[PDB]
Amino acid sequence: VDAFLGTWKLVDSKNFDDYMKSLGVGFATRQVASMTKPTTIIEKNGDILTLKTHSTFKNTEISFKLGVEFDETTADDRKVKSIVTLDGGKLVHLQKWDGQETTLVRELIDGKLILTLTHGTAVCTRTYEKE
């Protein structure tokens, strides 16, 4: 988990609009989230991980323990049952609600942080640079 720690900034985004759309977000919000480049901060204290997402539009913060289910309310205002795990070197975040699911996967690939969001048939890829 240690190489994930620190400050990272958004450098490239692909297919965010289809993802948002598949989840049910409105056009007006979509406009706004597409011009925005967030800051992500990953910290640790013992066995508790903290995840901050900062932007000029919306801000979020969660704290958890790997492999333990927790309640979360997302940036688009969903209320879900979540669990985060380490699988083959990757940081896998599973969210469940109303009988449906979405995955958020983080990978370190040649100096960089790569995030891939999957919902239904839609798949989005986002890359971050270490600040």
Ligand SMILES: CCCCCCCCCCCCCCCC(=O)O
């Ligand atoms: C998440 C950045 C703030 C903008 C929110 C736009 C509304 C869509 C919500 C999608 C939920 C997760 C998106 C995470 C984006 C990211 O971390 O790169």
